Amino acid sequence: DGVGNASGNWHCDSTWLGDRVITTSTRTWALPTYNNHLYKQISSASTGASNDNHYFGYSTPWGYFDFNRFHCHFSPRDWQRLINNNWGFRPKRLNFKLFNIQVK
């Protein structure tokens, strides 16, 4: 609850319980202004690409978070600690938080 108060703390733990491992990770982000706030369409007719490389789409000013790689959660020691004594792993649940926003 700002402005003179942090709206969240830095958590970057990685705890190893018996049959489950909780890998927190916190990063600092920076979001620019894309397209100068426009839904510009994108296609291949401007460049003139190949017959298999034609596309058509749209390009928003929105931006997404993609924590969809394994090293976004596992340090190389935690990955080594996992793959050496485990016949398997799967995720149960995630928990996403987004705090300390500064709009320059």
């Binding site: 340090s75 190389p76 020691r77 080594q80 050496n84």
Partner: protein, 103 residues
């Protein structure tokens, strides 16, 4: 100095011995003890079950540790196993100091 756990009261010595069964004594009484026993021996099984107490590591090291691995290669014989005619051969001495605690 050879390593290990110096114990004041160590595990006690378990001593075993075949009870001497004598052969036939003569008909007249003799004072001399016995110069003839029945040759015998024993066999059997023996179980030893030591419960150990482990100290789980509490490290915050980043990079991977050095750990005892087997040699991944096309080998002639598998280490710490039997041979073509059943001789268990330990190939190398394995210590116990592979992990890293800061001093």
């Amino acid at each position: 100095l050879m390593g290990g756990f110096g114990l004041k009261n160590p595990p006690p010595q378990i001593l075993i011995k075949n009870t001497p069964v004598p052969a036939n004594p003569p008909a007249e009484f003799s004072a001399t003890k016995f110069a003839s026993f029945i040759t015998q021996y024993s066999t059997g099984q023996v179980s030893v079950e030591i419960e150990w107490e482990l100290q789980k590591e509490n490290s915050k090291r980043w990079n991977p540790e050095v750990q005892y691995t087997s040699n991944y290669a096309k080998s002639a014989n598998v280490d710490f196993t039997v041979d073509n005619n059943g001789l268990y051969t330990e190939p190398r001495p394995i210590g116990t100091r592979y992990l890293t605690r800061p001093l």
